[PDB]
Symmetry: C2
Amino acid sequence: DLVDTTEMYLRTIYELEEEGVTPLRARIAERLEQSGPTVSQTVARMERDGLVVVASDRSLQMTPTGRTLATAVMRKHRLAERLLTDIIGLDINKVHDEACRWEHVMSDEVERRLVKVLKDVSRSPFGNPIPGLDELGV
Amino acid sequence: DLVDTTEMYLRTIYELEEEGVTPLRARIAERLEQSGPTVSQTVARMERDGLVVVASDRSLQMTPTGRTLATAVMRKHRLAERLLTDIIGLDINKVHDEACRWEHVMSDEVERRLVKVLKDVSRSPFGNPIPGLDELGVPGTRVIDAATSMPRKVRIVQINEIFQVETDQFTQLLDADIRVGSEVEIVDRHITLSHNGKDVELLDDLAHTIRIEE
């Protein structure tokens, strides 16, 4: 799905950065288990949508808009993990794969509610901080 | 997404049926907003997938497999609405739309957990009863499928001795106090049922028939 695939690329780029890794199409591919030509295809579309630009040095620089989108996806992704662990009680070993799906289907309104019903929305069960809370309106 | 499409298609046939409406292509198309041709192409696919049959009267008859999937999708859907209203507190005006998306991504594991965590899972906030609960668990899963590379505790639901030819391991299981209800820590390294401190390395036949639920 065009949009969902894009959100996964933006979230992946975000994570790499977060790990201190350089967003390189080959690493994105390797992390996504996808073929180079496929990631190229997708990153091309993404550029045409003004979400990313392959910097002259061939690294992937998220435009301001792409970054805002990548952040909201991660935000949802991480509120989702909190819902799963904190409330639903899902096996911790499944929280991330599930969250990888829900991040595409969760709405802003649900996010705000979760922010209001979860005891803490600072970090995810996995240690990384939950981004964009202020931009969400919570 | 083809998988998600079929699920939305099946859940809709399910809704009309429940509403007492005849599952007609024009009706479904209208409901899904999509056009009649698109629906025929998508119904054709399902028919080849053995999930639906365009009946005599031209209504859509879900095959058992179709209905089984339709029910599961509706279950996830209504379970999602309970999570959304009871726990999350999402505006009731936005619960249905949200649920139409979540039904495609909520795992069976999340469902069993919601069933445990929700106060009442008999009905959806909108009046209709939540289907497929029995087939969700709250029988069991064939040990061979439930067996993962990492151990975990599971409650025996059925051993199925009546179907066994090879009975050499019957006592082995009895000494290991592994019987109905017995929480045996299983794993896949073949499947080894561990309980009462003992371990029972099952054989293909036993592994397929013994069902451990959750």
